[PDB]
Amino acid sequence: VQLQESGGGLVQAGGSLRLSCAASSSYVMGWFRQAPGKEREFVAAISWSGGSTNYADSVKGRFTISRDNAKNTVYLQMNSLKPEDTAVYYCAADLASSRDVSSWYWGQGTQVTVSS
Amino acid sequence: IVGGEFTEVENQPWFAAIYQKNKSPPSFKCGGSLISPCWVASAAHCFIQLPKKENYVVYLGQSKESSYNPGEMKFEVEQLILHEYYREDSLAYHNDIALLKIRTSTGQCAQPSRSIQTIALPPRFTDAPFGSDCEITGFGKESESDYLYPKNLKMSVVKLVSHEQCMQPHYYGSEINYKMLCAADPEWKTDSCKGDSGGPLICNIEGRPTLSGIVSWGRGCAEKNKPGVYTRVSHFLDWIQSHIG
């Protein structure tokens, strides 16, 4: 299976960052994250055609999820970052069919740290 | 369901909510239809991975997912029958149909009420004319990429798509066959989705609500030239009768 994240690191507040995830399609792809002291939360998701996209309220309007079906890759463009966004980011795949309840599979994660 | 509305089970009293046990309250697994006081019809692919009957519980009369509904009936599964020629080919499921014999903790099966009723099976090989309105219901997501579930029963109307259209190249082509039926909104604004499998497609046949379809598969959710694909129940009456009958 094996989704691999990349692009994480240390950025100052208000800055930007671009996360990439390589999968090794027809499924929904997504991004989750685990802030300090919390369990894993939802960040974004996108269907195969880009037709439906979805975000968590806390990242609306400054996060953009994209997809490349040729290279089996999914991207998370993070603009205008704040200390609230410091977390371990996990790309994920919904390995359930389009009529079945979602069954998420997560990568190992990559650290994203935003200064202040 | 994408589009449509939140609804009460009174509008769809045959809806069966099928849950799967954990090691940790049960998780909603997929939908079904009460075709007999003791028998529920659902999709075979819902169960093909963990086919043991003890893994599942069935709730009737549920407008709300994973909370208490007044009038609810809880059932254990005493028989779990999957179609013996079930198969997965490409993205399609073939002979996608399953039977669930249900019994309460005291050995009873469904008692008819406002929120709990049986749905009529169609006559043999008989479907509504193509282009006819049919209703679909379930606890499924409101879009394919939504993380949350509505947690509340939804109902919508779609139209029957002929096999002649549905088998055209820019639709499904040959990955569908005649024991499936397609259903879609004319402008692709409503459809069954993630979590709706096993649920009912109800058409009006001979002046009565009729289980015409079982939510099976489809590429993406409410997408142009890609109707929802349903197990065509009118071609499985012998198989159904060989069990419950």
User: Rg of chain A over CA atoms, in angstroms?
Assistant: 13
Residue B101: partners with Cβ closer than 8 Å, 6 or more residues away: B38, B39, B40, B77, B78, B79, B80, B81, B244
Could you give the CA distance from residue A95 to residue A80 in angstroms, rounded to a whole number?
Answer: 31
Amino acid found at B72: E
Give yes or no: B196 in active site.
Answer: no
Measure B106 CA to nearest chain A CA, in Å: 30
Q: Which residues of A touch B219 (CB under 8 A)?
A: 26, 98
Could you give the CA distance from residue A8 to residue B156 in angstroms, rounded to a whole number?
Answer: 43
Amino acid found at B167: M
Amino acid found at B9: V
The DSSP element (H or E) to which A24 belongs, if any, is none
Give yes or no: B197 in active site.
Answer: yes
At B212, list the tokens: 């015409």
**With an 8 Å Cβ cutoff, is A26 touching chain B?**
yes
Could you give the CA distance from residue A23 to residue A93 in angstroms, rounded to a whole number?
Answer: 9
The DSSP element (H or E) to which A32 belongs, if any, is strand A28-34
Q: How many CB atoms lie within 10 A of CB B58?
A: 23
**Phi, psi values for residue B154, rounded to 5°:** -125, 150
- Nearest residue in B to A27, CA atom: B220
At B10, list the tokens: 């009174």
Give yes or no: B83 in active site.
Answer: no
Cα dist. A85→A3, A7, A75, B45, B135 in Å?
22, 15, 17, 39, 43
Contact call for A54 and B143, based on CB within 8 A:
yes
**With an 8 Å Cβ cutoff, is B49 touching chain A?**
no
The DSSP element (H or E) to which A18 belongs, if any, is strand A17-22
Which one, of B187, B159, B191, B164, lies nearest residue B176 by Cα?
Answer: B164
Could you give the CA distance from residue B32 to residue B4 in angstroms, rounded to a whole number?
Answer: 19
CATH assignment of B13-118+235-245?
2.40.10.10
**With an 8 Å Cβ cutoff, is A101 touching chain B?**
yes
At B193, list the tokens: 């989705």
3-state secondary structure labels for all residues of chain B? CECCEECCHHHCCCEEEEEECCCCCCEEEEEEEEEECCEEEECHHHCCCCCCHHHEEEEECCCECCCCCCCCEEEEEEEEEECCCCEEECCEEECCCEEEEEECCCCCCCCCECCECCCECCCCCCCCCCCCEEEEEECCCCCCCCCCCCCECEEEEEEEECHHHHCCCCCCHHHCCCCEEEEECCCCCCECCCCCCCCEEEEEECCEEEEEEEEEECCCCCECCECEEEEEHHHCHHHHHCCCC
Q: Which of B33, B94, B96, B192 is catalytic?
A: B96
**With an 8 Å Cβ cutoff, is A106 touching chain B?**
no
For every residue of A41-108, DSSP letters joined together read EEEEEE-TTS--EEE-GGGTTTEEEEEETTTTEEEEEE-S--GGG-EEEEEEEE-S-TTS---EEE--
Counted across chains A and B, CB pairs separated by less than 8 A come out at: 74
Query: What's A29's DSSP letter?
Result: E
Three-state SS for A38? Answer: coil
B205, with CB counted inside 10 A (0-12, 13-18, 19+), is: buried
Q: How many CB atoms lie within 10 A of CB B179?
A: 15
**With an 8 Å Cβ cutoff, is B27 touching chain A?**
yes
Quote the CATH superfamily of domain A1-116: Immunoglobulins (2.60.40.10)
Could you give the CA distance from residue B244 to residue A6 in angstroms, rounded to a whole number?
Answer: 55
- Nearest residue in B to A104, CA atom: B147
Q: Which residues of B touch A47 (CB under 8 A)?
A: 143-145, 220-221
Three-state SS for A11? Answer: strand
Q: Where are the domains of chain B?
A: 1-12+119-234, 13-118+235-245
**With an 8 Å Cβ cutoff, is B142 touching chain A?**
no
Cα dist. B141→A35, A101, B44, B155, B221 in Å?
26, 8, 20, 12, 10
Contact call for A98 and B193, based on CB within 8 A:
yes
User: Rg of chain B over CA atoms, in angstroms?
Assistant: 16
At B3, list the tokens: 């589009």
The strands making up A63-68's β-sheet, listed across from edge to edge, are A4-6, A17-22, A73-78, A63-68
Half-sphere exposure of B73 (CA within 13 A, CB side): 27
**With an 8 Å Cβ cutoff, is A96 touching chain B?**
yes
Residue B17: partners with Cβ closer than 8 Å, 6 or more residues away: B28, B31, B32, B58, B59, B60, B62, B65, B139
Contact B199, B30 (CB under 8 A): yes
Considering CB atoms only, which of A42, A52, A101 is closest to B144?
A52
Could you give the CA distance from residue A62 to residue B185 in angstroms, rounded to a whole number?
Answer: 33
Which one, of B167, B229, B163, B219, lies nearest residue B199 by Cα?
Answer: B229
Contact B132, B201 (CB under 8 A): no
Q: What is the resolution of this structure in A?
A: 2.3
